[PDB]
Each structure stands twice: as C-alpha cells, then as structure tokens.
Amino acid sequence: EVILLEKVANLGNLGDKVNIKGGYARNFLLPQGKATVATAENVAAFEARRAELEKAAAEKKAAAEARAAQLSELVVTL
C-alpha cells in the first residue's frame, strides 16, 4: 500500500509495494520521507523517474565508507 524509498529496512525493499500496518505507514514512514501511500493518480510519474532511485541510494552506502572511520576512534574523554 506504500512505495518504499530506502533499502536498509529489516523487511523492506527498494521500491516494492508492501502492505503494512496502518500505524507504521501513518506515524513513522510517511512523516520521515521514506515511504508514500500507493495512490493511482501519479503512477505514470514514477516510471519517468526510475533513474533517480540509483544515485542517492548508491551514495548513501558510499558515504558510510568514510563515516564509520571516525566513530570507533574511542577518543571521547568522559
């Protein structure tokens, strides 16, 4: 009932329509820009933007290549 927009969910995919609970669509996914309710009004707009899904979702895992190298330094003085 929703199109996903992130591939790091524990039971999610790239852009697959999944039918989920109403609270999970309502309260978490839609206010955080990671899913949108699968409506039958703009479906021909999704197929003319399928090459937009590759760039940011490849760059996200590519930015964590050098992001995790500064978290495990253990230089925080309590």
Binding site: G22, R26, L30, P31, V37
Partner: protein, 77 residues
C-alpha cells in the same frame, strides 16, 4: 466539545435495555482522540481531535484534502 473535527460526529443518545427491558437514557460518544498529522506542504504537524472514522478518512483522502475543507467549514486547524 466532543465532536470530531473531520466528520462532525458528536454524541448521540439512546437507551440501556435491561433483561427485564427497563430502558434508561444513556449516551453514545464518538471514539475521538488527539492525533498529530504531518503535512508535507506546510512542513509542520497539525493536531486535531478526531474520531477513528476520521482517521480512516485521512488515510483514504489525504491530510491535504481534509484540511482543505476543514477551513471552508471554518475549523481551528
């Protein structure tokens, strides 16, 4: 008061028939709760006291369509 801000469901009245069929005036209250609804086109939440039927109507029609004709009626949010 206890009216849904989406549907206008207020409280209605009826009876409490016993096993000996004694009728007593009771009242039927809507299942109205407070819920914050995220609007993308305003980049904020609105918090309106709606029934669960109103929740389902938000789910079916979108928050933007329902929030369009809340204010034609002239509600708070």
């Amino acid at each position: 008061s206890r009216v849904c801000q989406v549907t206008g469901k207020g409280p209605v009245t009826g009876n409490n028939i016993s096993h000996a069929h004694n009728k007593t005036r009771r009242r039927f209250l809507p299942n109205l709760q407070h819920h914050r609804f995220w609007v993308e086109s305003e980049k904020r939440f609105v918090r309106l006291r709606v029934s669960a039927k109103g929740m389902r109507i938000i789910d079916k029609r979108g928050i933007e369509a329902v929030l369009a004709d809340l204010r034609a009626r002239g509600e708070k949010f």
